[PDB]
């Protein structure tokens, strides 16, 4: 599955990625209640908050 980023948010940590409005992300991991998502855009894998993304 993926999310699509409708808000930009700025990596605070070596396993967080930055996203960016329009990004398609490919979902590794989804959202256990933590608030953050692990996927993937264009190769860069990390973790990003599901609540920027639809």
């Not at 599955?1 to 930009?8: K, N």
């Not at 329009?22 to 990390?46: A, F, P």
Request: proline share 4%; hydrophobic share 30%.
């Amino acid at each position: 599955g993926a999310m699509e980023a409708i808000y930009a948010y700025e990596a605070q940590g070596d396993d967080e990625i930055s996203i960016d409005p329009g990004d398609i992300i490919t979902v590794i991991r989804g959202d256990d209640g933590s608030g953050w998502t692990y996927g993937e855009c264009d190769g860069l894998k990390g973790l990003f908050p599901t609540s920027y993304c639809k």
